[PDB]
Structure 1
């Protein structure tokens, strides 16, 4: 139960204008207050929310400049009324002092002069930060409610809760004595802390933060407050601080609107002796701020295509007159312990704080048998697992420089590895990388450019072998390499390590030995996947010459090969890839979405359009040839049926390939055209119908049509080992 034991559990949101803090006091619930980031030099002796009203403290901190080392300061809303004020390394003293004060004030509320604070802040490295706060500090009150009290604060460890996970806790949980549940959100959502200086827009798909679309803007309440105050003065033809104007004139009226939905607000301010009714001068600024945010919020909604939009902060309370319109539109979630909206961030850090504080055959029992189709976009690999059949996946040929330390078919959707190969060069020879779709969501990405390069191809290949080895539960495998059309495939013999710094194989170190190799240069093995399959053992495929042609339909190009007597001949490749067809489908879908209400695109990348929208329907179509597909796209709040646009692009692609296919059959006159690659699955809607006329053969299993090239290389590898 109770960790105290002298522990102050708190969440701390330090910004440029206020220092918000949420802490467990004596009772077990949550208390919260804010100290403006303001400090003013003070004489060494004296000269509800009563505490922050007057903060005159002397701080003896070893995290301090020495200069402010042990000297007196005015802190907070009291420092505001000084003219040696300081307002936002340089100068850090401005942040650390009002923070230590809040801890002292918090500790004093629970009646302790020595408290140990596991620091749970947030960044608006990161052991880099906590070492700035570590050690023990003393805060002596020279005045105020705790006049003469000396609070001693020891900071041990902590979390910076930049992890993103913690930023959404205050909407799912609450602390009342014992921890409560308020999951009704989606797996993807936007969080918008509406601040006084800045509007912070964050987006979270899956579990955590998508910092490609995440932004910080200058849409704060200050500018609007500043103009309201100005016009008030122009009507008197004051309030000294912005905050003063909020707590006195504004904060009352807002809550009456909260206590009661039909309440008419009334802003009147007396100056000196005169009472002027400024009920509309305030309302305009309030409603105008409201408008700009809904504009801003909706733009970010279409940008992220989030399923839920959470709106928190004090900007909600300030613009509540116009922002209460959001309770009616779904996609938008206020937390409706709504007075607590301002401290939503600090509450989140408090909950998270609390949480961590709670603490024939073959035999192959160390050989990795794989066929490798390493390309310009995907590093496709087909390998044998324990059970003895073929598993296949593809790793996006994209890498990104990574920190050497931590900070189905989805063990590869967190690939953080270090590659130690003799085949690497630069200082890549000894450094960590983000591999696969994750140098996608990183701006230090490197992607193939039309050499070195080279590291760009070797790393996803070695990682693919890793994932394979780690999958069959071996902490290292001998790999007979089977690639495809003098080498420097001995970049690749010798031996290679890959160590998982994260992901499903956290801490697993996978070290790879390559000693043999074949290129399957002849084309005869490039077609092996349609005559054979490996199910536990090796079998001939259910229903199958002198010569045959092959059409691999890729993303970038459609390649044509011709084999006679099995042997490779007349081979060409057209840039008749799926990419331009997909791009103009996406182009068309987006433009059917451009009316009545509609910032970029509903789908994040080309892969996103396929993995989510397309290949589900294709699977229903493969399993059932009478099934009508239904392609529907949701973008923000808009749900439109784009079945036409997707089917049209598929069918045009189907004909264009058929047009190209028939031509290549004419010049080579092969007995058999085999159509393979991923383009088969994309244009399957029309290629399943045109298959019966032109007279060519598609492979079954057809779901694995993409890995056909890598599959054939695997069989050639297996056949090889059988001598």
Structure 2
């Protein structure tokens, strides 16, 4: 069986994928939504640290049809990198999202030792492009060749024939109910109604979706810009200021990965653990625990207020809260484990991949018909 099963959650910060590995388990990772033009040849998740790929796809035109690219983190450093341009408030972009998408597909396939994969697509609609108009941009054959990195020399044959965009579907909430451990397993809490919110707390955006009869109420459902990133930017600015009485991190993800994630992990598995944050810069090592915690708490609080305001607007029976924001502001948001109308994933560590996980589960049910 040459099938790669995945859920694909593409935004403009990152392209997220959850897929079944050879062990039948969910494996998740994210590729930053950044590409850059690259020459025909070369010069946890280490295999995506350096992506130089040739892609051949009819879903790309002109410059793009059959050439080489840097993708993801490796491309964040290129001078001529392309990123999504946002406002002071497809066609030419489509490659900026298709290439990281296909690359994630080629990486997963490499991860499971395959080179011919059929990829039934399981995705979500963006934020004119009908469900099977998005799909038709993905259908057919695409080849991804690794010109460098861990997989140098591998060619992947990605075939996409079919797919869903989980459009009005309740595929969105599946990751709160199920896991995949070779096969579908129910998950031990939730504490399940006919009315629930899903708040996906993200890097640049908070998705505030509302469900009645499991289909999406388009009116009340909304998408704000209440991301973590702003709070993260404030924290990083204060850290640098403190070091400026006699930048420590590259990207926000570096800040998240090396400083913040291990402290949050501990906090999760032990309710008593008081976290500490230390930053090494130059010849100096500062304790920036108050700085970091202030940012998280201000974020948790702001999100607490946003969640209540959406709870009244909908008067939903249950309010599911997911996304990376739940981890970033866990310090204050764990309080939601107490309140009645709020549901946090039990497996909180997989909170950032909630939506991709839901799609992946949705995809597996489709296969089982």
Q: What is the TM-score normalised by the length of structure 2?
A: 0.56
Once the two structures are TM-superposed, the CA of residue 206 in structure 1 deviates from its matched residue by 2.1
Q: Distance in 1 between matches of 2:280 and 2:149?
A: 56
CA RMSD, Structure 1 to Structure 2 (Å): 20.9
Residues 207-222 of structure 1: pairs in structure 2 closer than 5 A? 207-212=214-219
Once the two structures are TM-superposed, the CA of residue 164 in structure 1 deviates from its matched residue by 3.2
Q: Distance in 1 between matches of 2:144 and 2:362?
A: 74
- The match for 1:638 among 284, 289, 301 is 284
CA separation of 1:611/1:43 partners in 2, compared to 1, >3 Å: closer, same or farther? closer
Once the two structures are TM-superposed, the CA of residue 162 in structure 1 deviates from its matched residue by 2.0
SS at match of 1:639: strand
- The match for 2:60 among 56, 59, 64 is 64
CA separation of 1:720/1:604 partners in 2, compared to 1, >3 Å: closer, same or farther? same
CA contact (8 A) 2:321 2:344 kept: yes
- The match for 2:229 among 567, 576, 579 is 579
Once the two structures are TM-superposed, the CA of residue 666 in structure 1 deviates from its matched residue by 48
Residues 537-686 of structure 1: pairs in structure 2 closer than 5 A? none
1:78-97, Cα deviation, whole Å (9 max, x unpaired): 10011101011332110001
CA contact (8 A) 2:196 2:319 kept: no
Once the two structures are TM-superposed, the CA of residue 636 in structure 1 deviates from its matched residue by 50
- The answer to whether structure 1 residue 197 and structure 2 residue 204 are counterparts is yes
SS at match of 2:56: strand
CA separation of 1:686/1:694 partners in 2, compared to 1, >3 Å: closer, same or farther? farther
Q: Distance in 2 between matches of 1:707 and 1:14?
A: 11
Equivalent residues, number: 357
Q: Distance in 1 between matches of 2:29 and 2:277?
A: 50
Once the two structures are TM-superposed, the CA of residue 163 in structure 1 deviates from its matched residue by 2.2
SS at match of 1:148: coil
CA contact (8 A) 2:57 2:143 kept: yes
Q: Distance in 1 between matches of 2:271 and 2:121?
A: 60
CA contact (8 A) 1:8 1:23 kept: yes
SS at match of 1:192: strand
Once the two structures are TM-superposed, the CA of residue 660 in structure 1 deviates from its matched residue by 47
SS at match of 2:18: strand
Once the two structures are TM-superposed, the CA of residue 51 in structure 1 deviates from its matched residue by 1.1
1:594-647, Cα deviation, whole Å (9 max, x unpaired): 999xxxx99999999999999999999999999999999999999999999999
1:135 matched residue in structure 2 = 140
Once the two structures are TM-superposed, the CA of residue 67 in structure 1 deviates from its matched residue by 1.8
Q: Distance in 1 between matches of 2:368 and 2:182?
A: 68
Q: What is the TM-score normalised by the length of structure 1?
A: 0.29
Structure 2, unaligned stretches of length 5 or more? 85-90
Q: Distance in 2 between matches of 1:43 and 1:133?
A: 25
CA contact (8 A) 1:662 1:694 kept: no
Once the two structures are TM-superposed, the CA of residue 195 in structure 1 deviates from its matched residue by 1.0
Once the two structures are TM-superposed, the CA of residue 50 in structure 1 deviates from its matched residue by 1.3
CA separation of 1:210/1:617 partners in 2, compared to 1, >3 Å: closer, same or farther? farther
Once the two structures are TM-superposed, the CA of residue 574 in structure 1 deviates from its matched residue by 46
Q: Distance in 1 between matches of 2:149 and 2:276?
A: 68
Q: Distance in 2 between matches of 1:49 and 1:9?
A: 19
Once the two structures are TM-superposed, the CA of residue 65 in structure 1 deviates from its matched residue by 1.5
CA separation of 1:203/1:692 partners in 2, compared to 1, >3 Å: closer, same or farther? closer
CA separation of 1:707/1:19 partners in 2, compared to 1, >3 Å: closer, same or farther? closer
Q: Distance in 2 between matches of 1:711 and 1:577?
A: 21
Q: Distance in 2 between matches of 1:669 and 1:10?
A: 33
Q: Distance in 2 between matches of 1:632 and 1:48?
A: 22
CA contact (8 A) 2:197 2:318 kept: no
Larger radius of gyration: 1
CA separation of 1:52/1:574 partners in 2, compared to 1, >3 Å: closer, same or farther? closer
CA contact (8 A) 2:174 2:361 kept: no
CA separation of 1:166/1:604 partners in 2, compared to 1, >3 Å: closer, same or farther? farther
SS at match of 1:81: coil
Once the two structures are TM-superposed, the CA of residue 721 in structure 1 deviates from its matched residue by 55
Once the two structures are TM-superposed, the CA of residue 177 in structure 1 deviates from its matched residue by 1.2
CA separation of 1:94/1:187 partners in 2, compared to 1, >3 Å: closer, same or farther? same
CA separation of 1:43/1:21 partners in 2, compared to 1, >3 Å: closer, same or farther? same
CA contact (8 A) 1:44 1:72 kept: yes
CA separation of 1:58/1:585 partners in 2, compared to 1, >3 Å: closer, same or farther? closer
CA separation of 1:203/1:57 partners in 2, compared to 1, >3 Å: closer, same or farther? same
CA separation of 1:100/1:671 partners in 2, compared to 1, >3 Å: closer, same or farther? closer
1:659-685, Cα deviation, whole Å (9 max, x unpaired): 999999999999999999999999999
Once the two structures are TM-superposed, the CA of residue 135 in structure 1 deviates from its matched residue by 0.5
1:20-63, Cα deviation, whole Å (9 max, x unpaired): 00000100110000000100111111112111100000101111
Q: Distance in 1 between matches of 2:78 and 2:344?
A: 81
Structure 1, unaligned stretches of length 5 or more? 213-569
Deviates more, 1:635-644 or 1:166-175: 635-644
1:709 matched residue in structure 2 = 355
Higher RCO structure (Cα 8 Å, ≥6 apart): 2
2:87 matched residue in structure 1 = none
After TM superposition, what 4+ stretches of structure 1 lie above 3 angstroms from structure 2? 570-596, 601-723
